[PDB]
Structure formats: C-alpha cells, structure tokens
Amino acid sequence: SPEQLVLTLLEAEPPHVLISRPSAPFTEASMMMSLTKLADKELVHMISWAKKIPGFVELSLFDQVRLLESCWMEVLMMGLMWRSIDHPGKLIFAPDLVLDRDEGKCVEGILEIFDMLLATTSRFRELKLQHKEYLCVKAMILLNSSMYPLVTDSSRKLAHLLNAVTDALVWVIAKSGISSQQQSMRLANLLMLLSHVRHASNKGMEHLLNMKCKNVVPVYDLLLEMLNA
Template sequence: EIYLMKDIKRPLTESDVMMSLTNLADKELVHMISWAKKIPGFVELSLLDQVHLLECCWLEVLMIGLIWRSVEHPGKLIFSPDLSLSREEGSRVQGFVEIFDMLIAATSRVRELKLQREEYVCLKAMILLNSNMCL
C-alpha cells in the first residue's frame, strides 16, 4: 500500500487535492515499475518494449487500482489509506465531479461483479500486457 504520509487539513482546498493526488501518482508510478517487473516474462522484454507498455497503460493501471481500493466504500474514492474523497470534497477541483461520477459508477459495477483479489490482479496485468495498442 502506498500512503500520502502527509497531514491534510480539512476542508480541502483545490490546491490541497491536486497536490495530494500528484504526490500519490508519483509514488504509484514508481511502485508500478517494480510491480511490472514481477510479472512473469516482463523483464525478458526489451527495455524499449517495457517502457512502451508502461507509458501506454499507466493511467488505466492507476484507475483500476483506485477502483479496487474504493469498492468497499460506496460514494468515496480511496486514493490511499490516508486519503479518501467524497463527491463534495472532489467538487472543490474544477471539472473533477464528472470524473468522480464516472469512477464511482465504475466502482459500483466492479462491486456488483464481486471481483475477487486474484481476478483484480489478473485484470491489472492484462491491462499492462495488452497496452501495446497505443500510439
């Protein structure tokens, strides 16, 4: 698990939310590289192919992780164990409500599927390994 490891005063400002999400994304991207290297066969790919796959899928991998963490928390997005946002808190960032609503809807669909951890991990790996379609 990746933590923000920063006390955030509530109510959150737009700047607080954006800075926190950026810091978490940086940490998650570093972690994603380590995770990808653990997937059988990934390190046997050329470095160029490894980089290409990660460049093509990083956002989708981050989103499926966010959705997975949020499944047990209806109406909230769990960005990390120490940063969750309600729709109201997310609305402090211009344009975020639309994205928030789409992510909450996707989380609801995953909840309805009763996705198991093993299935989530396989889905995440499939996202990485099928990402070579991007330009």
C-alpha cells in the same frame, strides 16, 4: 501456468502508499497537490510491480517503456477502484486520504472523473469481483495496449504473456463452478469494463496535462516525465 502465474501476481502487489489530507481545508491547488504527490509515488512502485510479472523484463526495453507509458493511469485507477470497492460513494486513495464523491467539486473537471471511477467501481461491486480476478485484469491492463510496430520477437513474447494472463483469468473464473454460459458472460462483463477504465484514464490524463498547463499544480519527477509524454 495458471495457479503459479496467479500466485506471482499476488506476490507482485505494490505496497499501499500512505498520504494524509493537508491540515488546512482543501483548495483546488492543494487537492491536486495531494493526488499528484500520491500518483508520483505510486508510479515508482508500479515499475517494480511490472518487473515482477513473469516475462516483462524479457521484453525489449522499448516495449517495457511503451506499455508502462500507455497504461499507468489505467493501473493507478484500477488499484484505486479495488481499494474502494466496498465503500460506495467514496474513493479510497490512501488509508488516510478517503475522498467523498462530493469532494471532487473542489477541483474544476474532477467530479466527472470521480463519477466515472465510482460507477466503474460499483459495476465491479455488483459483479462481486474477486481478488484473483482483479489481479489478472490489472496485469491484462498492463499488457493489453495497442502497440503498432515501433521503429527501434518482443511482440511475440508480449502476445504469449497476455495469452497466459487471459488463460489465468478464465481458470480463476472456472473455480466458481457456474454454467459454461455464465462463465462466458462473466468474462465478457469483466473485459467490457476495460474500455471504461481506458476511458476514465483518458479523461484523467487530459485533466492532468491541462492542470499542468495552467500551473494549477507543479508536477515532479516521474509523474512529470510520464506526462511530458
């Protein structure tokens, strides 16, 4: 139910992971070390987050795993964009790791990703994305992956959940009071951005899978596992 669902998501928010710039100037290697080290630690906390979304832990293990494998980069990116929303030209990876757009030039292929992330963040800024809208959209990201049958009532449970989250977002938007037509337009504008997040996510994944090829960074643990696919 919408008020309670929204409160749960609010209370589910993962902690901000702290990381600092290296002492020495960035290199391609050390920049990727920082961002993947951050990502690995955020993944640990993403799991606890997911488990706090009502219904999530009632899905079958495979469904839980499959949604998280599918959406984790999108969710890292969406949390990054929310952190950065008020700081044009910057990506607020952590309180002490604030990258200017130009710093992506440090690593081959990453400027384009920064630019995609920055443009999507500016669109959310232009729409004046509210905290409670971001909570619902981020949860919609987790829950809205293609599934196709796997060969292993979870899937009906998934549909009900996503439904409730989408209802909660519609309910949040109705608080603004704007015209019925404008509430439809805002919903569309928000959801159409899900594509942009998926698209950036795809470019991010491929970057990381390739870096990992080149051994331009060693990757560890949860992050390595998620990537191994």
